[PDB]
């Protein structure tokens, strides 16, 4: 599962 909602966490 690739959760769009987790993307900014990865980038932070």
């Amino acid at each position, epitope marked *: 599962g690739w959760n*769009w909602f987790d*993307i900014t966490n990865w980038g932070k």
Partner: antibody, heavy 127, light 109 residues
Framework: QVQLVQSGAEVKRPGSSVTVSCKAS????????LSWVRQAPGRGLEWMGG????????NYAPRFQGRITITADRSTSTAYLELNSLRPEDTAVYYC????????????????????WGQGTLVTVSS | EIVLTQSPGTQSLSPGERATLSCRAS???????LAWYQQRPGQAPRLLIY???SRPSGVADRFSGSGSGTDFTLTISRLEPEDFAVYYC?????????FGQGTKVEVKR
């Protein structure tokens, strides 16, 4: 401190397209997810979609895929929601909302959930 | 699409009473990404709980969230006058985020 300011209420004719803006100040515009949520009169909240500015990553709800465009202008910290082919049922208050963060300040770890909300924009679809 | 069911849709309770609101998911919520919001007439929604149990700084500690998987609960230890409003749960454990239809907590008299 994060404050989201939306454009004023607007009357739109059926079939037209509406554009609602949301200007942010504080925290970081580019690295936090910005979503749009609407609420028709007397009804519940509905997530329409969102955008992560830094890489122009959009994510739309299937129900609006084909009628919606969400864009972010990093030079003005402004996000935009465009909804086409308006019908009376699109009459509602539209809110932009940015993801919250943990810890002091407003540059901590993103929490996904919507902590910052604009004042909303009433869009009235009518002739 | 994950359907979030909030039942009952209305709870008539007395000031100072305890309150438990149920939010059931049609399927498992990814990483317990369940959030709760409060909304009063004329105002924009306000985040109360995220990650099923985390409460952001500023939110009264009388609000607490519990549960995981498909069964979540928002608990209000005691109802203050300003707590009578509408409550929505939301799941964002996958790209397509959804809200429940909301539960209105009103004053019983």
């Amino acid at each position: 401190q994060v404050q989201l300011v939306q454009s004023g209420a607007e009357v739109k004719r059926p079939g037209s397209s509406v554009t609602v803006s949301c200007k942010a100040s504080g925290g970081s515009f580019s690295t936090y997810a910005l979503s749009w949520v609407r609420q028709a009169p007397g009804r519940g909240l509905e997530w329409m979609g969102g955008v992560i500015p830094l890489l122009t990553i959009t994510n739309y709800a299937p129900r609006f895929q084909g009628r919606i465009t969400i864009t972010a202008d990093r030079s003005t910290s402004t996000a935009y929601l465009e909804l086409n082919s308006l019908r009376p049922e699109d009459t509602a208050v539209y809110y932009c909302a940015r993801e919250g963060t943990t810890g002091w300040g407003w540059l901590g770890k993103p929490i996904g959930a919507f902590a910052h909300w604009g004042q909303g924009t009433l869009v009235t679809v009518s002739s | 699409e994950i359907v979030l069911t909030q039942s009952p849709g209305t709870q008539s309770l007395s000031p100072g009473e305890r309150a438990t609101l149920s939010c059931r998911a049609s399927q498992s919520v990814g990483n317990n990404k369940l959030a709760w919001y409060q909304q009063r007439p004329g105002q924009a929604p306000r985040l109360l709980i995220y990650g099923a149990s985390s409460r952001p700084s500023g939110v009264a500690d009388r609000f607490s969230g519990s549960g995981s998987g498909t069964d979540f609960t928002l608990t209000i230890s005691r109802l203050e006058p300003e707590d009578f409003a509408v409550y929505y749960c939301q799941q964002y454990g996958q790209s397509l985020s959804t809200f429940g239809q909301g539960t209105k907590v009103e004053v019983k008299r």
